[PDB]
């Protein structure tokens, strides 16, 4: 398994053309705020291709 290539699974909004997002901030996927901490409906945005 080559897991070195990653894609942004989660983001709040669509990018501009030629826009790069490398920010490793947490995403809020539910009503509950995450406060930078993983949990229920709190996921890392970057997941790797298998």
């Amino acid at each position: 398994g080559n897991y070195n290539y990653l894609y942004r699974l989660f983001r709040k909004s669509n990018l501009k053309p030629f826009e790069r997002d490398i920010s490793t901030e947490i995403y809020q996927a539910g009503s509950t705020p995450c406060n930078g901490v993983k949990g229920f409906n709190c996921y890392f945005p970057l997941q790797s291709y298998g």
Binding site: A29, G30, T32
Partner: protein, 50 residues
């Protein structure tokens, strides 16, 4: 019901509030495979099999 005789409920001719179902914290797993969880309140379907 049991899993060999799973109960099938036909959801039709009604308006469905998926925001209450999605914002509930009692559910330990909420995984969609053909749609988006945040777009369930925006999309329309012919019927739902539960």
């Amino acid at each position: 019901a049991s899993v060999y005789a799973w109960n099938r409920k036909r959801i039709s001719n009604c308006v469905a509030d998926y925001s209450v179902l999605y914002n509930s914290a009692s559910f330990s797993t909420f995984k969609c495979y053909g749609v988006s969880p945040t777009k369930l309140n925006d999309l329309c379907f012919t019927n739902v099999y539960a």
